[PDB]
Design a protein around this ligand. Sequence first.
Ligand code: 2TJ
Ligand code: S6P
Length: 585
Amino acid sequence: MPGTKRFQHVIETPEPGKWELSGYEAAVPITEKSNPLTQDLDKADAENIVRLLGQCDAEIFQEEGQSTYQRLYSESILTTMVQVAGKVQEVLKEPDGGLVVLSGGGTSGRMAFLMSVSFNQLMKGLGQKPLYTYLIAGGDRSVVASREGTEDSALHGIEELKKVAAGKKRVIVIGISVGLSAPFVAGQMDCCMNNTAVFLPVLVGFNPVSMARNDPIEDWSSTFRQVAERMQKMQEKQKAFVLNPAIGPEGLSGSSRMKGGSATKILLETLLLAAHKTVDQGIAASQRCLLEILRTFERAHQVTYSQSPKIATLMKSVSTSLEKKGHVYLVGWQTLGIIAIMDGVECIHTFGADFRDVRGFLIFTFSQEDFLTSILPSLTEIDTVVFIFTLDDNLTEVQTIVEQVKEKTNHIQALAHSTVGQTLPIPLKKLFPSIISITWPLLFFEYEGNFIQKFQRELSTKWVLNTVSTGAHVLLGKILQNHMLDLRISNSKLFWRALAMLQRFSGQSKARCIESLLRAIHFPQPLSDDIRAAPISCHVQVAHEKEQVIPIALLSLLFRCSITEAQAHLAAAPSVCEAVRSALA
Ligand SMILES: CC#C[C@H]1CN(S(=O)(=O)c2ccc(N)nc2)CCN1c1ccc(S(=O)(=O)NC)cc1
Ligand SMILES: O=P(O)(O)OC[C@@H](O)[C@@H](O)[C@H](O)[C@@H](O)CO
């Protein structure tokens, strides 16, 4: 029947009460799951929100229970990290015609960029040629833009890969996809397996391979799952690798920019740093050198979240400014500036928020005076401006900008990273009365830009900004339990996530949910057979431009009414949130 090809794979909605016993819950990929810690996140206050995400983030470092999924600390995973470190060594010994690509869509792609830079720096400070590069769904521009639609083509991924891999002789391709989902990566990994003389694919993500994505990709014949299963078979002969620890669900269901991006750095920085810092010692990478690093990353979580009360406060202020109608500026230096940009941009697609709502700034790349003359003018009594820097940064450039911002603003707060016993110039740096001083112990570092200190700091900022950005929006009522219902459908994964949210919150069949969804998307056109049979990309292209697609679709269902009737209802309610929530009641 029309549509059967496209929707056959979708699991039926269970009868009320049998969500567990239908086996439905057990087949939800971990990366899409509702985290039980966050069932009532939409009710939590700022302090709880910080607590509940701190807990969710902790799950990264939690160990394997005694019938269950491998985790970051499990022996199978650390052994895989060692073996991969090893293959990175091979290429490090033979830099001529060698290359190491880190690749991903969206936040996986963003993380890839950071790491390729860091490790390229590292080989510079040692006077070696840079061997790292990145690849992001939609080219370089995607690093710092909301561009969710660019991940759906396997040919694109392969193309980008062919460009960069030039006339190289030995290529390591680290395909990053948190959900083991992005068609962009899938095609890269498959291409690698079809030329193993040159390519070595390493897939990174955080689902078991039995939960890897399995619906058809429009421009490619195999699924992510088939690709990953075959890489796993090659791992026996050491010609492919799959590195996939479970880290437990996101605190915002399927918001893989959070734990997933974090785990990506923890996992890949750890392994690459080990491989470098152990080549020049002429010693194999071992579980012991990896562990040192992982434990440091784990202290970093503890260090970071011990500043929780302040983190809650900055959340309450970021939220306040967005409840009124102000903006939120994230101003930071080096690498920590970028991360700030990355957070701001992600808020657009993640919460449907305008790019001014939470914006990032590096010193998007607007210099000291340029910021003072351009942006400073537009500031306002209700806004919030966050400063993010180390005490190694150039604090004369910092104080200047805060001096000025204080006048036109007042809601400032800051994120200051330091070694123990560095002191904050100006004891009347108050200015910031109640800073977020994150003060780092003294580690022993032989590489020359203290790369472990950088990684700690990046990660810690990512945790803070993410928790803030996400928390501020939850407080506003935009989140339904631990799901973002009212998302914009801009790729296929999001289209499937909409359909899952329709099933979950309505309890109605998949045929009904699909029908309501496609009607909401294509309104005012009716459901023809063509539309029913259309590739998922046709729906995406149309829904991408509309507003409230998913809430309209859900209303149609709850009221058993038409799209015309549910649009009218929505427009007659005070808000999307009250409309949906009170139809649920
Ligand atoms: C319909 C459907 C579905 C699946 C898979 N889709 S998928 O096909 O894009 C996908 C993504 C990643 C992956 N590893 N496998 C499939 C994502 C959303 N999915 C999903 C399924 C269930 C839920 S939920 O159970 O309502 N939240 C607990 C949330 C999301
Ligand atoms: O790394 P994945 O699972 O292939 O997901 C890649 C991207 O879709 C994902 O990072 C997304 O852009 C983020 O907005 C999710 O919060």
